[PDB]
Amino acid sequence: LPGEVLAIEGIFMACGLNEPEYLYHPLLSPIKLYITGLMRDKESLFEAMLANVRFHSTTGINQLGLSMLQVSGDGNMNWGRALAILTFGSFVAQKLSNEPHLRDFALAVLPAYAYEAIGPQWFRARGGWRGLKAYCTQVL
Amino acid sequence: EQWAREIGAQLRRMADDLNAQYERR
Ligand SMILES: [Br-]
Ligand SMILES: [Br-]
Ligand SMILES: [Br-]
């Protein structure tokens, strides 16, 4: 495994930018396949979120990062919230792909926001990516 | 003008449905 923030960026690359990873990973590759399915099925809800939100800017990407932190503002985390955060970041990446500079700022900051939003200690104390995959196979 | 919390609540609601699937017997 590459490191949490790095792995999340890869998830945004594979799921948001639809950039097929060249090598298969036992844990991350199925997770990426699950998040893509979540984007497809819940596209309408993600569109509703960002409907009247002006996020195509560095200021907007900052607020998108704040949006991730708002998920766990009550101090609670589960793999459901973790998936919503990771899928939301991927969806954001997809909408910024045709704007190189904004896309790259998103890739630069949002992986760290998603990781913090989940909670680094909670992530590690619940099995990390193995725990997430197990949750995915059971729910999706 | 701020819209981060509303998105946070909508992500929470989306997570609720996933957790409902996890808890389904
Ligand atoms: Br915009
Ligand atoms: Br741009
Ligand atoms: Br598994």
Numbering used by the authors:
A (entry chain A): 6 to 145
B (entry chain B): 131 to 155
Task: Give sentences copied directly from the paper behind this entry.
Kaposi sarcoma herpes virus (KSHV), a member of the gammaherpesvirinae, has been shown to encode for KsBcl-2, a potent inhibitor of Bcl-2 mediated apoptosis. KsBcl-2 acts by directly engaging host pro-apoptotic Bcl-2 proteins including Bak, Bax and Bok, the BH3-only proteins; Bim, Bid, Bik, Hrk, Noxa and Puma. We also show KsBcl-2 adopts a globular conserved monomeric Bcl-2-fold structure similar to other characterized herpes virus encoded Bcl-2 homologs and binds BH3 motif peptides using the canonical Bcl-2 ligand binding groove. KsBcl-2 lacks any significant shared sequence identity with mammalian Bcl-2 proteins though it does contain a recognizable “NWGR” sequence motif in the BH1 region, which is crucial for pro-survival function of majority of Bcl-2 family proteins.
To establish the structural basis for BH3 ligand engagement by KsBcl-2 we then determined the crystal structure of KsBcl-2 complexes with two of the identified high affinity interactors, Bid and Puma BH3. The KsBcl-2:Bid complex was refined to 1.41 Å, whereas the KsBcl-2:Puma complex was refined to 2.11 Å. Clear and continuous electron density was observed for KsBcl-2 residues 1–146 and Bid residues 79–104 in the KsBcl-2: Bid BH3 complex, as well as KsBcl-2 residues 1–146 and Puma residues 130–155 in the KsBcl-2: Puma BH3 complex. Similarly, in the KsBcl-2: Puma BH3 complex Puma residues I137, L141, M144 and L148 protrude into the four hydrophobic pockets and an extra hydrophobic pocket is occupied by Puma residue W133. Additionally, an ionic interaction is formed by R142PUMA and D79KsBcl-2. However, the expected ionic interaction between pro-survival Bcl-2 proteins and pro-apoptotic BH3 motif ligands between a conserved arginine in the BH1 motif and aspartate of the BH3-motif was surprisingly absent. Additional hydrogen bonds are found between Q132PUMA and Q68KsBcl-2, R142PUMA and V76KsBcl-2, N149PUMA and N83KsBcl-2 as well as between N149BID and Y140KsBcl-2. However, this highly conserved interaction was not seen or is very weak in the KsBcl-2: Puma complex where the closest proximity for this interaction is 5.6 Å. In place of this interaction an alternative salt bridge is observed between D79 KsBcl-2 and R142Puma. Mcl-1:Puma features the hallmark interaction between the conserved Arg residue of the NWGR motif and the well conserved Asp residue of BH3 motif, whereas in KsBcl-2:Puma the NWGR motif is present but this hallmark interaction with the conserved Asp from the BH3 motif is absent.
